[PDB]
Amino acid sequence: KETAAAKFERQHMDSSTSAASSSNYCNQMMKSRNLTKDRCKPVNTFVHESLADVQAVCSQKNVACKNGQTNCYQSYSTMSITDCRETGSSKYPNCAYKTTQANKHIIVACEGNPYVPVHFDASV
């Protein structure tokens, strides 16, 4: 089965664009990345940075995750991100999202060896 690390990349990485370029970015990306296959995932962030840079966060500022776990890390730098949030008109299988571009620090949880991000916690 797909690894947690691979799932992170699939759900959260978009190194191919520097930012969302239209209001349809989330609609298209949530679909292409298979995030609307079983149900509409309600919230999802895409990170417009190199994978290595995001992987590096695992060696940055240790912080408790939202749920209390202590394997979260906050980026020292802001990153370009796109927040995808389901809209009022979203109705499975026609999931609809509002696209929001921002530059924020990201908080991810890391695991493994190599120690890499496996979950997107928050943007701050």
Domain boundaries, the chain: 1-124
The token duo for 17 is: 């664009």
Buried b (16+ CB within 10 A) or exposed e, 2-40: eeebeebbebbbbeeeeebeeeebbbebbeebebbeeeb
Report whether 41 belongs to an annotated binding site: yes
Q: What method did the depositors use to determine the structure?
A: X-ray
Beta-carbon contacts of 7 under 8 Å, excluding residues fewer than 6 positions away, are 118
Nearest CA to 77 out of 107, 51, 104, 46 is that of: 104
The angstrom resolution of this structure is 1.2
105 given a catalytic annotation: no
| Residue 83, φ and ψ in degrees, nearest 5 | -100, 130
12 given a catalytic annotation: yes
| Contact (Cβ atoms closer than 8 angstroms) between residue 72 and residue 62 | yes
The one-letter amino acid at 68: G
- Torsion region of 34: left, alpha or beta (phi above 0 gives left; psi -120 to 50 gives alpha): left
CA–CA separation, 45 vs 80, rounded Å? Answer: 10
Q: Which CATH number does 1-124 carry? A: 3.10.130.10
